[PDB]
Scaffold this active site. Structure first.
Site, short mmCIF file in Angstrom:
data_model
loop_
_atom_site.label_atom_id
_atom_site.label_comp_id
_atom_site.label_asym_id
_atom_site.label_seq_id
_atom_site.Cartn_x
_atom_site.Cartn_y
_atom_site.Cartn_z
N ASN A 89 -2.96 8.42 0.12
CA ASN A 89 -3.99 7.59 -0.69
C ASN A 89 -5.28 7.30 0.31
O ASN A 89 -5.13 7.38 1.37
CB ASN A 89 -3.40 6.28 -1.28
CG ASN A 89 -2.17 6.63 -2.26
OD1 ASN A 89 -2.31 7.44 -3.06
ND2 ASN A 89 -1.08 5.90 -1.82
N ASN A 117 4.71 3.87 -3.58
CA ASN A 117 3.51 3.55 -2.70
C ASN A 117 4.13 2.82 -1.59
O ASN A 117 4.51 1.75 -1.57
CB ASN A 117 2.23 3.01 -3.25
CG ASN A 117 0.87 2.89 -2.73
OD1 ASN A 117 1.00 3.04 -1.54
ND2 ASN A 117 -0.13 2.98 -3.42
N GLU A 150 3.70 12.52 -11.88
CA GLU A 150 3.46 12.00 -10.85
C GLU A 150 4.00 13.23 -9.86
O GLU A 150 3.34 13.26 -8.40
CB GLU A 150 4.45 10.93 -10.38
CG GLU A 150 4.01 9.72 -11.06
CD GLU A 150 2.85 8.98 -10.62
OE1 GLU A 150 2.13 9.74 -9.58
OE2 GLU A 150 2.25 8.24 -11.29
N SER A 197 -2.30 4.38 2.78
CA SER A 197 -0.83 4.39 2.37
C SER A 197 -0.66 5.82 1.86
O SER A 197 -1.44 6.57 1.72
CB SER A 197 -0.60 3.31 1.03
OG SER A 197 -1.24 3.83 -0.15
N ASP A 252 7.70 -5.77 -11.94
CA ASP A 252 7.03 -6.84 -11.26
C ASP A 252 5.65 -7.33 -12.33
O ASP A 252 5.10 -8.33 -11.75
CB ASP A 252 6.12 -5.76 -10.32
CG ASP A 252 5.48 -6.66 -9.08
OD1 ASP A 252 6.26 -7.42 -8.46
OD2 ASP A 252 4.47 -6.59 -8.65
N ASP A 306 2.18 8.05 -1.17
CA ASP A 306 3.14 7.84 -2.30
C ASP A 306 4.13 8.77 -1.95
O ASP A 306 3.97 10.04 -1.53
CB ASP A 306 2.18 8.36 -3.46
CG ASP A 306 1.37 7.22 -3.94
OD1 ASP A 306 1.47 6.04 -3.50
OD2 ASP A 306 0.78 7.51 -5.16
N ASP A 317 -6.74 4.81 0.90
CA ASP A 317 -6.45 3.29 1.87
C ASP A 317 -5.53 3.47 3.05
O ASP A 317 -5.35 2.70 3.75
CB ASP A 317 -6.15 2.29 1.03
CG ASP A 317 -4.54 2.21 0.07
OD1 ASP A 317 -4.06 3.25 0.49
OD2 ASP A 317 -3.99 1.35 -0.31
CL LIG Z 1 -5.25 4.72 -4.80
#
Ligand SMILES: [Cl-]
Ligand SMILES: [Cl-]
Ligand SMILES: [Cl-]
Ligand SMILES: [Cl-]
Ligand SMILES: [Cl-]
Ligand SMILES: [Cl-]
Ligand SMILES: [Cl-]
Ligand SMILES: [Cl-]
Ligand SMILES: [Cl-]
Ligand SMILES: [Cl-]
Ligand SMILES: [Cl-]
Ligand SMILES: [Cl-]
Ligand SMILES: [Cl-]
Ligand SMILES: [Cl-]
Ligand SMILES: [Cl-]
Ligand SMILES: [Cl-]
Ligand SMILES: [Cl-]
Ligand code: NA
Ligand SMILES: [Pt+2]
Ligand SMILES: [Pt+2]
EC number: 3.2.1.17
Length: 129
Positions: free
Chosen positions: A46, A59, A35, A50, A101, A52, A48
């Site tokens: 990202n 995220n 990562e 967002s 989650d 990370d 969208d």
């Molecule tokens: Cl993504």
């Protein structure tokens, strides 16, 4: 901060990640390697909108607040900047919530694609733990 491999294994163990939700330490170290290459200050935008953050690329769509991710939540109740600290406590605390989650470590796409099912014990091999 850029951790060394065994240095991060030791920090993650002190903060209770080893065998958390049944995932051995080597799974966590492997996920951090792919990562962030063990860099706490890693950030990546990202598609969208967002972002990370940190060693485990957590995220802003769900987990932390960065003020620029519309419609997102902040389930770890932290500014995303906390996830870039040299002290990994906030990234570990939040990772514990993520891995609880429902989908385990599959929430980290690099873990699923690069770690899952491999010899992850290699990541801790040699470390005084
Ligand atoms: Cl993504
Ligand atoms: Cl390495
Ligand atoms: Cl430690
Ligand atoms: Cl430490
Ligand atoms: Cl320590
Ligand atoms: Cl392991
Ligand atoms: Cl936001
Ligand atoms: Cl705020
Ligand atoms: Cl929230
Ligand atoms: Cl804040
Ligand atoms: Cl905040
Ligand atoms: Cl804030
Ligand atoms: Cl705030
Ligand atoms: Cl604030
Ligand atoms: Cl630490
Ligand atoms: Cl520490
Ligand atoms: Cl699981
Ligand atoms: Na957010
Ligand atoms: Pt330490
Ligand atoms: Pt804030």
């Amino acid at each position: 901060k850029v951790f060394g491999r065994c240095e991060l294994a030791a920090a993650m163990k002190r903060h209770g990640l080893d065998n958390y939700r049944g995932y051995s330490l080597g799974n966590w170290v492997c996920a951090a390697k792919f990562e962030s290459n063990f860099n706490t200050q890693a950030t990546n935008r990202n598609t969208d909108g967002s972002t990370d953050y940190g060693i485990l690329q957590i995220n802003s769509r769900w987990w932390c607040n960065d003020g620029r991710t519309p419609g997102s939540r902040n389930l770890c109740n932290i500014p995303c900047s906390a996830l870039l600290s040299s002290d990994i406590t906030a990234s570990v605390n939040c990772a514990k919530k993520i891995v609880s989650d429902g989908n385990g470590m599959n929430a980290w796409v690099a873990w699923r694609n690069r770690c899952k099912g491999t010899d992850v014990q290699a990541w801790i091999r040699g470390c005084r733990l």
